[PDB]
Amino acid sequence: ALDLGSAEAKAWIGVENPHRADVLTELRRSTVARVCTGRAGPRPRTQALLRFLADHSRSKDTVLKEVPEEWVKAQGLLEVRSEISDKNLYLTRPDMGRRLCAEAVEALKAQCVANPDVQVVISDGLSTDAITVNYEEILPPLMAGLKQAGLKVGTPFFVRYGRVKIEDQIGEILGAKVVILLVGERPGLGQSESLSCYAVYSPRMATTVEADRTCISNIHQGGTPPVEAAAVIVDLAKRMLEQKASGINMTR
Amino acid sequence: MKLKTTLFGNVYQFKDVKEVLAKANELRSGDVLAGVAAASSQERVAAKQVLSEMTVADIRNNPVIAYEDDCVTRLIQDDVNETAYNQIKNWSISELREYVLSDETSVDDIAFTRKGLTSEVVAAVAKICSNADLIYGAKKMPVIKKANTTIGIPGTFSARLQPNDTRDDVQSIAAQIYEGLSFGVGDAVIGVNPVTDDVENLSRVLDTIYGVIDKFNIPTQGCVLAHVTTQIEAIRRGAPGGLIFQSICGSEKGLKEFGVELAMLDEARAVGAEFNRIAGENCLYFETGQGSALSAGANFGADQVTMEARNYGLARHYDPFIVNTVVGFIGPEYLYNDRQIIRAGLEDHFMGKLSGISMGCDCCYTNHADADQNLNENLMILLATAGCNYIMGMPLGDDIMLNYQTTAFHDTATVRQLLNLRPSPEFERWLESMGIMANGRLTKRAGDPSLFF
Amino acid sequence: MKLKTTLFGNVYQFKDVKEVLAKANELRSGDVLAGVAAASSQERVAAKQVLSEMTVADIRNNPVIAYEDDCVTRLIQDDVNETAYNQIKNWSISELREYVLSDETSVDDIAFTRKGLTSEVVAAVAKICSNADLIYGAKKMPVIKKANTTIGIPGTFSARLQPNDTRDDVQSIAAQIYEGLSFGVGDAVIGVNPVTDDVENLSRVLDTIYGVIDKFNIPTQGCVLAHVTTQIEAIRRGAPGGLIFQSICGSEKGLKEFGVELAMLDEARAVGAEFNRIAGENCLYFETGQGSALSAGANFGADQVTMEARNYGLARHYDPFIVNTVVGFIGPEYLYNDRQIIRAGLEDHFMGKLSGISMGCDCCYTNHADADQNLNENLMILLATAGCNYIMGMPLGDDIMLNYQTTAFHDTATVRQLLNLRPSPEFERWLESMGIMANGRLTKRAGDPSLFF
Amino acid sequence: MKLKTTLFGNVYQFKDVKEVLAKANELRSGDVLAGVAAASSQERVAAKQVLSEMTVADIRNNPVIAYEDDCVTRLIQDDVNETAYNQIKNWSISELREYVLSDETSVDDIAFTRKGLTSEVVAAVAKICSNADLIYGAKKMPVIKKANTTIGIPGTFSARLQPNDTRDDVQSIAAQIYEGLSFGVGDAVIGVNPVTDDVENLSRVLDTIYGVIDKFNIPTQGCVLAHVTTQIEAIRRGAPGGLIFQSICGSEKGLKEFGVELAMLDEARAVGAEFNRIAGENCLYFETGQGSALSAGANFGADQVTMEARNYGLARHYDPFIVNTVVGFIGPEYLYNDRQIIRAGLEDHFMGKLSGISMGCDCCYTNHADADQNLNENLMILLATAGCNYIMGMPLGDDIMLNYQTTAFHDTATVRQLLNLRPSPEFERWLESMGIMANGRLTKRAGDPSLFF
Ligand code: B12
Ligand SMILES: CC[C@H]1O[C@@H](n2cnc3c(N)ncnc32)[C@H](O)[C@@H]1O
Ligand SMILES: CC[C@H]1O[C@@H](n2cnc3c(N)ncnc32)[C@H](O)[C@@H]1O
Ligand SMILES: CC[C@H]1O[C@@H](n2cnc3c(N)ncnc32)[C@H](O)[C@@H]1O
Ligand SMILES: [N+]
Ligand SMILES: [N+]
Ligand SMILES: [N+]
């Protein structure tokens, strides 16, 4: 018996006649990459191929799963969506995901502050597990760090079916100087918890290039921990207000 | 020129060259998203016929972006050999396709002919080519470059070792390097996509790669796929320089979206010649892929195939060691399923070899796309028969930080032994001296990273 | 044997071997139509694991159709070499897959090991193989037969000339013959699908085929793909006998649907040995393809991949000169799109080569299926790299009578020059004498049927 | 650095590096005319020892002409790869000589090492090399370029067709062309030294050269060795562009004597990329020779060997298709007799190959020098064994216009059949098609210009 999703299956060494088997254990634990699985001629071994296909079956399900509406109320956020209606349309229309819907603009100017210094926006993006798993570990300290010896903090809200360039419209509707976007990257084969952070200083739908944004990616338990992340975005946020710039326009 | 044809008694009218180029493409989800695709299978064939009867001058004089408004267009236009253009300016696109496919057309014939072409003309020929046309045509157009390894020689097949990590952990990066070398991967480049983009981290990643290279005297070159500005600064400060990388787009607006100017690529060329540890004359590395122009809003109503060909006319000016499209890196909104990704892979490689660049391909797909690993194995072998210069290499193709699946280390060994292809001749001698390869085939002790210890 | 496994904490239990064999298949419209397909990717992977852990004995002792009820099951079971079986009866399907793929397993090792396999075991290995596994594994399992040409030698690639006509017009058939011979097609066979199934019409078609053969002293063989009984009657009455053909099914019920008795194939072998103009010892021809048994209601709850392997176990008993699957001949209800037709083509070829038959493939599709000619060009090249013994050939692949698209005469010449493959050595010498081929490449005067006049 | 040594109890002290470089030269009439030659064999040997013990850094940091005063010095210094330099900056010239001569130093090792050299260092190595050292060392440093022919491949030997005339008569030039093509001469270039330096006369000579090229589809290139500015003007106005030529000198003052600005060579490269009928990437042609700088009063107290190396450092920046010294073109005041012309020819070729340029040689002498045709035959064979890329060709070597003797058409064919060398592979295929050459040897009907009529 063997569960392909088990740690024993993840730590499996398939090299038949190793030169130094103790080194193979050292190398396998040194990375999440699927190393040391051996070979059958020039082809992958059966168990390694099985764990590949098994992990892929799970990854395809993490694409179409959505965050429940009961989970977003337990965090006290405004339920706003873009022009996209369902998950199938979001995967094929990236242009509609970069723009809010009609009833979205009327809820931002009404239930949020005017001209904040830092604006924290959250969206599911391409992965739901990237949001739910790390939410409670990155948001409490992010909002506290921006008010501990910080400045004018904006009102947080959740954008459903959102992309990255949608923060350019938020940066004008709310008029924020710095907009922080926590969005889920596309799911990997082995995991889907990876979260990113897209920040920009004073975005403008007509002139902001993607190079003007600063990106903090791979925020998860295997990459940058959410608590450690949260601290480095607050620092990032302070540097944008000082140098009046973002992305490639910064220094250091 | 005619913008009109009659098919089964039906007149199909097209507005300009830009619309004909778009609607002549095989069906793909990106052209639909761009609103430039044909409305029916009949109009698509009609666009192909209209395109086939247009001349080289008709497409050379009607680029998708104006000269005075786009530096990439100017670069493509200024580099054309006008003597070679005048010889073919009146050929139809139908006659240029037959010229390329002809067995009486030698490699030296194409070497001069391609100088009279522009990227729009390169895309035009691919649009009227079938899959076997794109494969056979690209095969007879080899492009050979040389860094510390020679790449593109017919009968050879290289591979990029791609040891990416979620935290740029050098222990994880080095582990994937030993794993790749044990399969014969790495003659193209040992290139890492970095997590954090700072000079200190790039140097740490570079010292890790070159520590392995120097310890075993590996004939190859390292690279960190960060921004070109931070790569130049790192090498200027003493980091070991191999290949200098930059992601490119086919428009001036697209380059601005990437934060790249043409002068940066000029500086990278001069920095490589002064600092880089390269025996050959080629040291630059570019990555491309359909959909990048439309993603940046910088396609100007042009289809993604034509925009991708413009990448090659831009890359050709800087004579890089390697270029590869990342065929299915983005998502299903630009390339939906297996059919589209394979087609795009054959298109990109054919257009790259037609443009005279050392064209490879990252046979890959995403998890929100209608694809699996059997797709990558189909495409990598089709492209291998096409003479594809190199593919990628990761442990089973699982990229733990870029969230996609490329080709495995096993795949390059499979392709080489299946098709009787060798690695780069310099790298093959190292593999032989390491006991990893004999007569182009993996030894019994190959595939074991513990052999380097 | 275990019929269950735990995947991601969920237990996946299966009824019998037959269900495990079916749900391990990649997704295809045929297994859905049969109600035997896996409900999700998770259950498919779980079925693959349970299958990979089953032993050769577990599958050899559980044929999809019982011994005492099916003469194809008996034929498969009776021809097993019990000494070769007892050596591998305790091997798991995972170990047999790795044994076939091993570079340390020579062609002579597999020659004896396959004698201990049954068709169900052959199907079992294919179900846990990737596309590249199917391609590389088949490449290292060559099968060589001899009629008037030698087929299946590594480095060679043959093709069947298929000159069909809506009325069996001897002017239309002969015109397609000269066209195909000008591209180097016909070393496998010159085979005609007859519109009318009568003796006098067959002799007229055979006299036309052999009239060309006798005029230019062509080393090859003719064949008319009618029912085997009418072929026997024509040759007994004096028609030129070359290859004797019959369509086969993987079950006794499926053979009765075609009107075939095993005695007929025994008679075909005896008629060939007395009358046929064949120098070698192989003179039979069979065609297969996934979906035939389900179409006849003769799959008995088994998947189309398992049933297709039983075709190869049947054919191996009669040692035919050539066998080819007709991968997409029927329709989308069994193989819907490009992804499934390619995958089935690789499975079929792999299973045929593991069974020890001269396995070719009719890379083809129908017009009511989600496919186009670019699918035929993708698969024909992948299968060539797999060492596929032969494909079909028709003018542009357009069958004016069978109403489907196969591979073109251009496609065989393309594959041969792309992969540096030669025809059958006897046929290659003839093409060289006719000035059609030089060093495996078409001369300038090739591709011209008026050369024969 | 030490500038002195003790030899046979006598102390030999030198002023600077420039004096050490000069007195280390073998005796030649040019160094005596410059007042920089050693007074005896003892002082020459002592200078060689002091030079051999100086490091690469000692000579790289002491160019014969200062950086801020000379644009050739800047060009040489700016193009140095500082990473390759820092690896060898502490190597003595004795160690660099042994490194080049080592059978354990591969062509790929030198490919990177030479990038850390300057011309003064290249000259330094040659000064402590014997004749056999110069020959064997150059042989293991091949340099391969490509225009419409490939030149410099080991095992091959090319030649320039030089059809000069006292009045640029197109009947006299064409007559010499057919004579040379009948001996297999012309794979390097068909280059004419024009009597009159005007645009209209150049186009007439180019039209005659290319009229023959176009008539017989010859793979080669034409060139008229006028001033580069007038060549640019003719090609811009529509003259057939092949190779663009210019004579070069090792100093800025020497270039002004020829009327050459560095921008002109940059313009020549750009004009070639737009107009020239060249398939490969190399289209420039330079000629050199010891004594040019001293003749222009632009040696600045440096010896003619050191100044000649600076020519190669200049040329390498523009990556030309061919460079050849004209070893004895000037007169005895720089190279007096057979001994000195041979030695200079070996030095020049060695230095050119160490600099990484496609180094040929015009083995020639003048009638006011102490030399005869047997000198040209001695040197052409020694340089061939050295792997010299090409020599000249004229009817019996008699230049009716330049008033000197070079090598004959017979001499290239002699060298090729004596040493089993072949022409450029493209040109060899053409000669074989014309029945002129078979297996590298002249057919019976070769050497006959009436064959072309
Ligand atoms: C696919 C992808 C791209 C695609 C984007 C196309 C698309 N997504 O439609 C393209 C080909 C443009 C690309 C190129 C680049 N990318 Co990128 N990209 C990714 C990737 C794999 C996925 C992003 C994602 O899933 N986002 C979630 C979805 C829901 O958002 P989206 O709106 O659909 O995607 C947008 C953003 O992702 C943005 N984007 C993509 N890449 C980058 C990089 C930077 C620096 C920025 C500011 C924005 C950006 O473009 C998309 C359209 O607006 C990430 C890897 C990761 N782990 O996230 C790297 C990643 C974000 N890219 C990265 C890099 C290095 C680059 C380049 C700078 C490469 C270069 N040297 O030029 C360029 C930047 C181009 C730009 N300025 O927009 C790095 C960022 C490193 C850093 N310190 O910021 C990442 C994190 C991967 C890595 N190598 O570490 N990339
Ligand atoms: C972090 C994205 C990485 O993948 C590469 N890439 C993927 N798709 C494309 C594309 N379509 N165009 C250019 N570069 C691309 C890019 O160079 C960068 O290194
Ligand atoms: C007139 C149909 C022709 O196609 C062949 N054919 C097509 N599909 C199959 C199949 N699935 N099994 C057996 N034979 C097949 C058959 O032999 C016959 O000659
Ligand atoms: C009309 C003299 C010709 O001979 C060539 N030549 C002869 N000696 C030298 C030399 N020493 N340096 C440069 N070029 C030279 C020069 O290029 C010109 O084409
Ligand atoms: N692109
Ligand atoms: N079947
Ligand atoms: N000189």
- The values of phi and psi at residue D10, to 5°, are -100, 135
Using DSSP's 3-state secondary structure scheme, residue A119 falls into strand
Residues A9, A105, single domain; the answer is no
Nearest chain A CA: its distance from C104 CA (Å): 7
Q: Select from A67, A95, A122 the last residue of a domain.
A: A67
Q: Is A164 annotated as a binding residue?
A: yes
Residues A151, A241, single domain; the answer is yes
Residues A5, A54, single domain; the answer is yes
Does ligand 2 have an atom closer than 6 angstroms to the CB of B329?
yes
Interface test with C, best of B129, B134, B339, B353 (most C CBs within 10 A): B339
Cα separation, C113 vs C108, in Å, equals 9
Cα separation, C294 vs C307, in Å, equals 9
Cα separation, D453 vs D447, in Å, equals 14
Strands D158-161, D150-151: parallel, antiparallel or unpaired by DSSP? unpaired
Contacts of D192 (CB under 8 A, 6+ apart): D162, D163, D164, D168, D173, D205, D209, D223, D224, D225
Task: Tell whether B214 is within 8 A of chain D (Cβ).
Answer: no
Which domain, by its residues, includes A142?
Answer: 68-252
Cα separation, A153 vs A172, in Å, equals 16
CB < 8 Å & 24+ apart, contacts of A152-155: A152/A113, A152/A115, A152/A116, A152/A117, A152/A118, A153/A116, A153/A117, A153/A118, A153/A120, A154/A112, A154/A113, A154/A116, A154/A117, A154/A118, A154/A119, A154/A120, A155/A78, A155/A111, A155/A112, A155/A113, A155/A116
Is C343 in contact with B417 (Cβ distance < 8 A)? no
Using DSSP's 3-state secondary structure scheme, residue C211 falls into helix
For the record, the structure tokens of D133 come out as: 């050292």
CA angle D437, D441, D442 (to 5 degrees): 55
Q: Are C260 and C244 in contact (CB under 8 A)?
A: no
**Helix, strand, coil abundance in chain D, percent, nearest 5:** 50, 15, 40
Q: Are C238 and C267 in contact (CB under 8 A)?
A: no
Q: Are B406 and A52 in contact (CB under 8 A)?
A: no
Residues A192, A230, single domain; the answer is yes
Cα separation, C398 vs C380, in Å, equals 16
Using DSSP's 3-state secondary structure scheme, residue B126 falls into helix
For ligand 7, which residues put their CB under 6 angstroms from it? Answer: D 250, 288-290, 292-293, 307-308, 311
Does ligand 6 have an atom closer than 6 angstroms to the CB of C64?
no
* Cα-only R_g, chain A: 21
Residue A127, CA distances (Å) to A59, A65, B406 in order: 10, 8, 20
Contacts of A130 (CB under 8 A, 6+ apart): A124, A183, A184, A185, A192, A193, A194, A195, A220
For ligand 1, which residues put their CB under 6 angstroms from it? Answer: A 94, 125-126, 163-165, 183, 185-186, 194, 196, 210-211, 213, 215, 217-218; B 193, 195-197, 227, 246-247, 257-258, 292, 295, 329-330, 402-403
Cα separation, B16 vs B54, in Å, equals 12
- Compute the distance from residue D287 Cα to the ligand 4 centre, in Å: 6
Closest CA to D348 of D391, D319, D317: D391
Residues A112, A182, single domain; the answer is yes
- Compute the distance from residue B290 Cα to the ligand 2 centre, in Å: 10
CA angle D23, D26, D31 (to 5 degrees): 60
Q: Are A27 and B178 in contact (CB under 8 A)?
A: yes
State which H helix or E strand residue B41 sits in. Answer: helix B41-53
* Cα-only R_g, chain B: 21
Residues A19, A74, single domain; the answer is no
Does ligand 6 have an atom closer than 6 angstroms to the CB of C308?
yes
For the record, the structure tokens of C67 come out as: 């011994």
Cα separation, D108 vs A193, in Å, equals 47
For the record, the structure tokens of B293 come out as: 């122009």
Laid out side by side, the sheet with D158-161 consists of D222-224, D189-192, D158-161, D390-393
- Residue C327's identity, in one-letter code, is V
A-proximal residues of C, 73-112, CB under 8 Å: 94, 97-98, 101-105
Is B374 in contact with C343 (Cβ distance < 8 A)? yes
CA angle D125, D127, D131 (to 5 degrees): 100
Closest CA to D330 of D300, D294, D282: D294
B-proximal residues of A, 106-135, CB under 8 Å: 126
Counting beta carbons within 10 angstroms of the beta carbon of residue D36, is it exposed (0 to 12), middle (13 to 18) or buried (19 or more)? buried
- The values of phi and psi at residue B351, to 5°, are -65, -35
Counting beta carbons within 10 angstroms of the beta carbon of residue D272, is it exposed (0 to 12), middle (13 to 18) or buried (19 or more)? buried
- Kindly report the three-state secondary structure assignment for every residue of A189-243: CCCCCCEEEEEEECCCCCCCCHHHEEEEEEECCCCECHHHHHHHHHHHHHHHHHH
Count other Cβ atoms within 10 Å, centred on residue C59. Answer: 27
For the record, the structure tokens of B167 come out as: 């935290």
Task: Tell whether A5 is within 8 A of chain C (Cβ).
Answer: yes
Cα separation, D387 vs D140, in Å, equals 8
Residue C258, CA distances (Å) to A157, C228, C311, C332 in order: 68, 10, 13, 22
* CB-facing half-sphere around the CA of C183: CA atoms within 13 A: 27
Residues A23, A76, single domain; the answer is no
Residue B450, CA distances (Å) to A13, A19, D76 in order: 12, 6, 46
DSSP for D433-451, written as a single string? HTTSEETTEE-TT-S-GGG
Task: Tell whether D103 is within 8 A of chain B (Cβ).
Answer: no
Closest CA to B73 of B235, B262, B356: B262
Please name the residue of chain C whose CA is at the shortest distance from the CA of residue B380. Answer: C132
Give the position, in ligand 4's atom list, of the atom nearest the Cα of D290.
11
Cα separation, C261 vs D186, in Å, equals 75
Q: Select from A67, A87, A114 the last residue of a domain.
A: A67
Residues A119, A133, single domain; the answer is yes
Q: Are D298 and D202 in contact (CB under 8 A)?
A: no
What is the sign, positive or negative, of the torsion defined by CA atoms of C136, C138, C142, C147? Answer: negative
C103 contacts on B by Cβ (under 8 Å): 417, 441-442
Does ligand 6 have an atom closer than 6 angstroms to the CB of C299?
no
Residues A203, A106, single domain; the answer is yes
For the record, the structure tokens of A170 come out as: 């938020």
- Residue D84's identity, in one-letter code, is A
Cα separation, D158 vs D390, in Å, equals 5
Q: Select from A67, A87, A102 the last residue of a domain.
A: A67
For the record, the structure tokens of B150 come out as: 């020679």
CA angle C338, C343, C348 (to 5 degrees): 125
Q: Tell how far CA A16 is from the center of its chain.
A: 39
Q: Are B356 and B316 in contact (CB under 8 A)?
A: yes
Closest CA to B65 of B119, B111, B130: B119
Counting beta carbons within 10 angstroms of the beta carbon of residue D139, is it exposed (0 to 12), middle (13 to 18) or buried (19 or more)? middle
CB < 8 Å & 24+ apart, contacts of B9-12: B10/B42, B10/B46, B12/B42, B12/B43, B12/B46, B12/B47, B12/B50
- For A73-194, strand residue ranges (E) read 78-81, 118-125, 157-160, 178-184
Cα separation, D249 vs D257, in Å, equals 9
What is the sign, positive or negative, of the torsion defined by CA atoms of B139, B145, B146, B149? Answer: negative
Alpha helix ranges (H) inside B153-291? 170-181, 199-216, 228-236, 252-257, 262-275
Cα separation, B184 vs C42, in Å, equals 33
Does ligand 6 have an atom closer than 6 angstroms to the CB of C246?
no
Cα separation, C399 vs C372, in Å, equals 14
Tokens 């057939």 sit at which residue?
A: D240
- Residue C365's identity, in one-letter code, is Y
* Nearest 10 degrees: Cα torsion D131, D136, D141, D142: 100
What is the sign, positive or negative, of the torsion defined by CA atoms of A204, A206, A211, A215? Answer: positive
**Helix, strand, coil abundance in chain A, percent, nearest 5:** 40, 15, 40
State which H helix or E strand residue A145 sits in. Answer: helix A135-147
Residues A137, A206, single domain; the answer is yes
State which H helix or E strand residue C355 sits in. Answer: helix C338-355
DSSP for D15-52, written as a single string? SSHHHHHHHTSPP-HHHHHHT-S-SSHHHHHHHHHHHH
Residue D149, CA distances (Å) to B214, B254, C70, D324 in order: 38, 39, 70, 17
Nearest chain C CA: its distance from A54 CA (Å): 6
Is A5 in contact with C8 (Cβ distance < 8 A)? yes
A1 contacts on C by Cβ (under 8 Å): 2, 5-6
Q: How many domains does chain A have?
A: 2
Cα separation, A72 vs A131, in Å, equals 11
Nearest chain A CA: its distance from C9 CA (Å): 8
Task: Tell whether B417 is within 8 A of chain A (Cβ).
Answer: yes
Q: Is D194 annotated as a binding residue?
A: yes
Q: Tell how far CA B293 is from the center of its chain.
A: 15
Is B166 in contact with A222 (Cβ distance < 8 A)? yes
Q: Are D439 and D184 in contact (CB under 8 A)?
A: no
Cα separation, C276 vs C288, in Å, equals 23
- The values of phi and psi at residue C419, to 5°, are -105, 10
Strands B158-161, B189-192: parallel, antiparallel or unpaired by DSSP? parallel
Task: Tell whether A148 is within 8 A of chain B (Cβ).
Answer: no
For the record, the structure tokens of D73 come out as: 């010095």
Cα separation, D164 vs D172, in Å, equals 8
Using DSSP's 3-state secondary structure scheme, residue B66 falls into coil
For the record, the structure tokens of D431 come out as: 């000669």
Experimental technique behind these coordinates: X-ray
- Compute the distance from residue D250 Cα to the ligand 7 centre, in Å: 6
For the record, the structure tokens of D96 come out as: 């660099």
Residues A83, A47, single domain; the answer is no
Q: Is C320 annotated as a binding residue?
A: no
Closest CA to B74 of B320, B297, B257, B262: B262
Cα separation, D150 vs D217, in Å, equals 16
* Cα-only R_g, chain C: 21
Cα separation, D63 vs D365, in Å, equals 31
Q: Are C247 and C258 in contact (CB under 8 A)?
A: yes
Q: How big is chain D, counted in residues?
A: 453
DSSP C321: S
Strands D437-438, B10-13: parallel, antiparallel or unpaired by DSSP? unpaired
Residue D430, CA distances (Å) to C67, D218, D436, D447 in order: 71, 7, 9, 15
Looking at the CA of B327, name the nearest ligand. Answer: 2
State which H helix or E strand residue B151 sits in. Answer: strand B150-151
DSSP for D259-274, written as a single string? T--HHHHHHHHHHHHH
Does ligand 6 have an atom closer than 6 angstroms to the CB of C158?
no
**Helix, strand, coil abundance in chain C, percent, nearest 5:** 50, 15, 40
Using DSSP's 3-state secondary structure scheme, residue D107 falls into helix
Cα separation, D218 vs D208, in Å, equals 14
Q: Are D158 and D390 in contact (CB under 8 A)?
A: yes
Alpha helix ranges (H) inside B303-423? 304-317, 338-354, 373-385, 409-419
- For D142-243, strand residue ranges (E) read 145-146, 150-151, 158-161, 189-192, 222-224
DSSP C149: S
Nearest chain B CA: its distance from D436 CA (Å): 22
- Residue D56's identity, in one-letter code, is V
Nearest chain A CA: its distance from B3 CA (Å): 30
Residues A76, A201, single domain; the answer is yes
